[PDB]
Amino acid sequence: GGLTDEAALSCCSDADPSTKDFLLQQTMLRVKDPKKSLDFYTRVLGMTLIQKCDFPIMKFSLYFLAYEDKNDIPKEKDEKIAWALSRKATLELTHNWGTEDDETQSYHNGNSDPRGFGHIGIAVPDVYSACKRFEELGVKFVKKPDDGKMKGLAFIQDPDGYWIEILNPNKMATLM
Amino acid sequence: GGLTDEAALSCCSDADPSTKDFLLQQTMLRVKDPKKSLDFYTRVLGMTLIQKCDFPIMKFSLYFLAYEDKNDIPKEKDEKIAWALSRKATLELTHNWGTEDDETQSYHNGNSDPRGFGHIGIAVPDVYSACKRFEELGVKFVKKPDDGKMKGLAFIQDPDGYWIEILNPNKMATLM
Ligand SMILES: COc1c(/C=C/C(=O)c2ccc(O)cc2)ccc(O)c1O
Ligand SMILES: COc1c(/C=C\C(=O)c2ccc(O)cc2)ccc(O)c1O
Ligand SMILES: [Zn+2]
Ligand SMILES: [Zn+2]
16 A cells, blocks of 8 residues: 655665756647637637647648746747746647547547546646636636545546546645 | 747747736655655655645545755745745646555556656756766666667656656757
8 A cells, every 4th residue: 555655765775966957848648629728728718839840741730728927938949948948847739740630539538548648737826716717718627626536626627538637736735 | 730939929829917926836646655655756756745634524645745955945834835836837646545555556657648748857967967866776767868760858757647747958959
């Protein structure tokens, strides 16, 4: 039954100095329809589209979303790429051209065989106010705030059905 | 042929004030064996274990990793949960107890059918130096920096086989 705190921490090395400037920059998800996905992440969740890359040979596009003030995005192309790819906590959406037109195609959300990735998670000031608004907007839920044993935590789904955790960090010390 | 720049932006909404303090707090991956995972993410990648939660009735644990200075971790348990779950860009590792003693179980990395999730990525000052060190330490690679078309970009594998991009933001314009 799992590692104790002490045992887990025994498994943790200090950071080599060579890694001291490393940052966790992106999480990449493939999206069926980038129009729907852009609309959800910006209008529903209040992210900003900070960069778009197209690769006509490989027939895909990349869309980088972040919680960033659009007024901070550099105007010049090279500058813009360097800035967006050095932001922490970006969402990279990959659009393989032609999926949005293919009724037989969908992506897998990791939460059923074969499992792996589970979710991204958004910290909000208030899970119940955020979720009321998501409800007014027609968002699909996996788990409402008062559903289940883990009250005060929610899961919604994006247009591909990827799961997104809605957590309030300042309430969460009544859970462990 | 994928979206135009104009058509992409046209599907973007400004951020509703209800989202003004939202942040992208976590990516969750499921891990077969936390002992290997914690060693990798801390010793190899230089992350810090900032919080561990255990759920003995549901038989799992959560491990929160992040690029944070271990001297910023609050000393007190409840403040620590609130600080840790309000950090941007955490990796959340879920260990369902028992997987690590099951030769018939393995997690899927999302890069073979059925695809969805693709990878996380770490921005680094120096892709080649980082990956020389990874090689020294026995790390498994999907793509060495000089392999294939996209020179100067790498993908490594974690203990469960999740792909991790290794990029230098300031070469990603140049490397044309
Ligand atoms: C996906 O991450 C990247 C890529 C690379 C993207 C791909 O090669 C890709 C194409 C189709 C697919 O199904 C999955 C991946 C290229 C540059 C870059 O900065 C970056 O972050
Ligand atoms: C959702 O991840 C959490 C959880 C709880 C749940 C999971 O991580 C999860 C595990 C297995 C699965 O198949 C789906 C989801 C509980 C508290 C918390 O802060 C947090 O981030
Ligand atoms: Zn990427
Ligand atoms: Zn989570």
